RNA sequence: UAUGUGAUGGAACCUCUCCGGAUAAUUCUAUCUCUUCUG
């Protein structure tokens, strides 16, 4: 549904392989290391190391799409799921949200020292800080959502 | 007033609360810990010292006085007292607050005696001061009868320091006691320094208090008694001493926050960590950063005084190499070993109180932070539970009341707690994740909180209570547990016999589906040793004459050591024992003086003690059972961090612990046994993959889950006896070129274990008494499975290490064969049975071509399930095998006896010969990909070939001479032009020496019998007549040219008389020729229109010259006639010989011999042109001259041709110019021509001393020839002058007339011998490049990489060929390219760039593509399943992006060989064991004597790959023969015989086993499909016709063995051979698809040859001596039979010889 | 650096869950080396 199309359902955060059909290594790289891979046998596969256009060298723009996709699932289809399912969706979203913020905040200090000799140009800072503030908006929503359940 | 000083002396430690602002003095953090010491903070510097307020001391004195007066019925030596009030009041915690201080305990009562009122207060009321009525009064200026001042540190009244410099912060928790998990925690501060212990204050009494002498005496007596009974203040154990009663700033309450003082030199450590990380990423070894971050702490433990870090593995014979980590270059410092020492020395010099331990700790923390910042995915990280600190306090709402029960007896108990098992007390600070807590001076610490918690847990178990203490409730909790812990005092303890740093333990989490670790599963912790002594002190003050029964029961349990004290009790830690128990009882009602003498033993040690019984008790809730397991194979368990510091240099070393009561102890950690038990239970019950959140299954009950605890404790398993280690070597063998890929020698030190001499393991397992039946049955089943031998101990289990219940010699051998079937017959393989011929010599090895189809699978069978028939049936069992040798076998050991010639013994395990399983595994696997057409499991896909440029070959060479530019961008490069140079000559002197250099020997002469010999050749009589002057000349010649010239002049030169010969020759017809206009169009005189007009009458044959002249004069008109005459120069005119022409020639007074040759050259046919006739005459003259010279003098010296007196030689030899040479800037030289100016390439550089144009300069040596002769003896020297003449024939470059090899005189240098048998050198002239105006050209990046590989190739080849270092040709470079290096550049059109860089004109080509993509395109992908991206230069992009686990692996899955045997990520499903012998010492070949093997050399890849377009031939295989007898006979021979083998350093001496010697071994497998089992059985047991090949010296015929399969133990499951055979046939038909060529070739390579008449050898490069001596020689074979183009054949065809027997 | 008719903080185990695993035959023959002068 105009998404990664690898997760079986937001109710059970699983992906039954078949993610290598996508072309972007970023999509494949992330889907293998925070979701259980289903099946009862090990899965071995890969891509052809000839993919052009590079890999964009960043993770944050990718798993940020997980945050919006997971949060909207609760706000649309979260009432039918059980208590264990409700906690799993929110807890997973918080874990991925803070990782991006940690990377962005660490970039902020190392750049705030650099911007002093760059003619106080905050154009790059504004784009990054807005995303950091946008994550903090999701940070408040996630914790508040779980506090209502408990 | 009167002052009575007080003294508070702490014994071990106390607690402190930090500083708070005045507005924040009523918060939760302050009300909690209100009874602790406070911290000061001044305005000037924000620093202060702790102090004790007087209110705590007043409260303690009041409590002690209350107890004393209750115990004595209100009469303490005449001090009659009344109870008081203890109610009302307006006490406040702080003046600027409303917290209110109120009681919570019950006050004691006594009967009232005497009269007490306001006028005459009683001593108790005088101390209390209840009649002052402080209500509604501030009392700031109001006096006080009794006042308590503050208490400060004695001797440190004015000393500031800081909070972090005096105290340390610990986090302490609370345990649920139902599930052993934390619920609440908070923070504390503690002071353990010995200086900050004594506190001194004073009590001030006003004049009103001192009413008279008796009142003051009573007050002093009561105060003294109360001070005696005071026990604890501010959370510590103390005693109070009362002195004699005789005598006469701001806190900065504004807004300010400051914390996180960090530590000194933290920035320096961070910079060091950054530098180390930068170096590691520079050398791309970031996968060892965590290993280094733990190795630094290992160095912390390992001391600096005797430190010796390891080195390389000593490659070649005796030269150590560089360690992969310890020899990392860092900022032009090659040795990290020296860099670390220098950094530590600098740090020690710069800072004070700095030692090795602190530096290592800080560096380890810095590197850990750097690794976590840069190298992510190196560790696991969700921690939801274990948070929410809780502190609660509640002021009472009612009056607590009063009681009437108080203490009457006091007990003191001493003892010792000794750790019989490693312990762990976690230390965690809110602001190296876990570390063992210890004092600041290094002493290990056992806190009192842990002891009290353990005691209350045990007493609650005894009493069967369910108390949780509910933090702060409205009323005291009561109940016996708290009622007894309200009266127990426990002292803080420290280790007495240990102060060294603790060890480090590691744990991992496996992945059940793959059998390997997870992505980031790696944990570490600090662990204390075993044998540490801790003092024990207990104090019980209660109104009973005997100890409570619960305490006696707990002490009985502790005396047996049946409970755990430390944290990690799951893996059997923290077991302590109580010994030397003593006690004493005091009666405070009648023996007050005896008690007060020693203050309960906390001031003076107690004199007399009484022994306590503590009989026994068996009520404890744990059950102990012993476990014994015998291991029947060498045992290895890796300790990667320890192996990086041991000076032995071993790659893998075992784990060891320490014991304080006694040396290294070898063991298997209890964590490993717990993991094995859990895995066995999960596999048996299929619970290894179920989600374990609120599960309550068997696995979640025996071992617990995240939210619960475990019911089992596993202790360590200690080896009993005196174990010994051994060195075991390993290597990886390439499948294309059989032989080690590179220096992959792998070392290990396993404990030697044999079925006859087993290793015994002893350990304990503790299980709770509340475990249900099913869990116990599962545990028993798992223990039985482990004891049966289903799980090996430690690593390397697939190679036969650590096998349980392995006795292969119990079976009565494997006679014949069972379950035998023929794969060749059922698959209709022709096999080409053929017949062999004795008269040919065959190759020792061939190549097997690759297949077409590789069958891969995405999902192999998993490991987490014992049996799941999802797609097919899975079996598991063992196979019995037997091995015997058809030819002698060589398995060298790791120990040798010698220094120059190393002799070797057979492999053995402490005097018992055996065969390792690695060899069998390797050979079986190789045969497996041979059959199933799998991938190449070991393959050097990362390697580029070089080859060598041929001197001549459509252009042979098109390289230009160029020089590097200045210090600009390295891309630019400028062309140049080359000329001759000096600095390489022989001698410089006058012409006399040059003319005397000749005349060594070989002077040509003329003798009379030459004429007689010529007369037999039917030579012309005129030739003899003309040679008679030559006969009588009596002249000796030395050059061929002068002799030929003299012969021509004396006999007669046709060229001298050419004009009249041409004039007298008959002139005939004239015809047009296209070649005339083709080679006459150079001149512009003739127009193209004239050419077209002449071509119009094409192919016009005229009668004679007259007709052609007339046609030329008539057809061509109206133009100048000079071009008409010039056209006649190249016309084709016929030549005819007539008698009249000969007569006219004779009349011209020409020599008669010319006419004689003319007559002998009579030809009826007319010549095409005069030039043809002249060429024929020249050819005849040359033939006659050669025939004459063939009968020259017989000096036998091959008279040299005229070379030496040439002007070129004179100008080259005269100009030495050894000195006056400069290697910088433009040169100053001139072109000194030898009085002849013809063209370029003929000049020299005179170096000053035309236009005088010069630039640059070069300096290098040249090639060294190989020829055996004695010219001038001499020896090597730095003079580099030539001393020699003659030797060998120089091949001519191009030709003036004819191109042919010809002998010439050449200078040479003396042989280096002063095999040191044929050495020479030819260099005569050197090169220099002059500057030219050429635009710089960018250089491709790959050129420098090619140059580095080329330079490494020269260094390796020079080291291999043993050439002298002084005269190494070509001076290269240390690294990169410098702005000014002079190298030859090669340019093509391309994109106006340079692609390749070479140092001289003739060098190694170096390829452009890697070996990984040289497999033929008509063959399926045979690259390894686990791929490497580095085939291109894009691995850096992937590393930066981090997407490395996705681009790996073939996109289709795993090949059958990698599935069955395992890959790096998967685990193998077949295990090969050790092969033993029935007798300890089997018979040895050669009567037990050592065999001197010949020299063995490395395989050369550039023999099946001659050209750049060559493809990989295939796998390499060895044939069977009987060449070992020749090797044995050549050894054991007398030295005088030249056919013997010498004992050089490159040779080796080994021992071999005779034939028909039997060995037995077993193969264990699990989760195998039936087709895999059938194929494995067939591979192990081939047809009786064939045999295997094992061991060393395969090319010499050593190591033919045969394996017989005896039985298959598939377990309870039923198995039949028909199904196995059918499945194997189906799989083979699916794979090969009715293809037999490769199969027939493979079965031809495996045929066994027993005939003694078949000889296989090597071509033995080059052939010497006369006669034939075989066609031996790699060059001569390449010339005629094999050839480079066809060499991709006759090598893939098995059993093909190269030459016949002479 | 404390306020006097009222201090169970000795009123609280940094605890709990995790096989330092997994891959690899101690082996093995064909060249090495660049400037020669018109032959
Ligand atoms: Zn009184
Ligand atoms: Zn209680
Ligand atoms: Zn479970
Ligand atoms: Zn494979």
Author numbering:
A (entry chain A): 2 to 151
B (entry chain B): 16 to 263, 275 to 457, 463 to 693, 725 to 1015, 1022 to 1317, 1339 to 1403, 1405 to 1792
Give the text the authors published on this PDB structure:
DmTPR-CHAT makes multi-domain interactions with DmCas7-11–crRNA via its NTD and CTD, forming two major binding sites.
Cryo-EM data processing of the Craspase complex revealed flexibility of the TPR and CTD, in contrast to the NTD which is rigidly bound to the complex. These findings show that the NTD is sufficient for the association of DmTPR-CHAT with DmCas7-11–crRNA. Asp310 or Asp307 (CLD) and Lys1526 (insertion finger) form a salt bridge facilitated by interactions between the insertion finger and the NTD. This network of interactions stabilizes the CLD. Strikingly, the highly conserved amino acid Asp682 implicated in nuclease activity is proximal to this region, indicating that target cleavage occurs nearby.
